[model samples]
Target: GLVPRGSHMDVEKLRQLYAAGERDFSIVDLRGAVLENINLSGAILHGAMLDEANLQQANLSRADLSGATLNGADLRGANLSKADLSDAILDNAILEGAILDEAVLN
Candidate 1:
């Protein structure tokens, strides 16, 4: 099991951090946030609310996204290998060039 680092983070805080040239956002709450070109590989995001978020070209390999809400999220060219997406809501989400090898969708 992956251990989450730090407390929950809102979209504004994430934006502030990202604007400072930070890209590693492991273990944080990003509900309803619009993120693009982010790298969150091997992060723990269990039960996160990401509905309507944009995650184009994001690196989410080996991340835990089980029970996460990603409805209408953009995932173009995102890497999701070995990620857990079981019970995740992906309605209207784009998966263009997204890798789903060994990812759980059930």
Candidate 2:
């Protein structure tokens, strides 16, 4: 489980924590985060703000990403099986190989 060590977050600092069980992550500015290859199954991300964030290969199986702003985010190869992206903003975001098996969309 990845706990907050200091401030925002990067790879090495987070790997300084991970089994990556830290969920919630709502209403925060993760626009500058490098969140790749992490697990967020069943997480709640209501009204989250993550512009151009790195969400590649992230495990977001049942995540409720309602009202999230993810414009220009790199969603390459992330897992979103049943994740709800209702009203999520993803304009010009790269979703090449991003998995979306039954996720809710607006």
Candidate 3:
């Protein structure tokens, strides 16, 4: 029952937000967009862009990241317990400290 209220996810928006020098775009949708980490934990990133997104130490425990792209995303030290990561791309996602106890990363 939650939907993001904002402009459409596009390159302009991404550039505007990222290029603004703000590194705390937590919970923002970046579907198929390039973005880096900024301590996004327990945020609403369901089906958001994370392909190759650097998520070092991102606290994503219980985050609804189901079906999100995480190919090559640095997920080190990220708490993803009980989070919905089903069908999420993890081709090269770092899981050194990522909690996947209840996460569905199929």
- Candidate with the greatest lDDT versus the true structure: 2
State the local distance difference test value for candidate 2. 0.75
Model 1 per-residue lDDT tens digits across residues 16-85: 6655655445445565566788777776677776776778888889878887778888899999999889
Winner by TM-score:
2
Candidate 3 lDDT, tens digit per residue, 1-106? 1233353355455445544543333445554443344444455565666776656666666677866777877777777787778766778788997778887666
In model 3, what lDDT does residue 50 have?
70
What are the per-residue Cα lDDT tens digits for candidate 2 across 37-98? 87767777777776888889988789888888888988899888899999988788888998
**Per-prediction TM-score to the true structure, in the order listed:** 0.73, 0.78, 0.61
> Poorest 10 consecutive residues of model 3 by lDDT?
1-10
Where does candidate 1 have its weakest 10-residue lDDT segment?
1-10
Between candidates 2 and 3, the lDDT winner: 2
Better of 1 and 3 by TM-score: 1
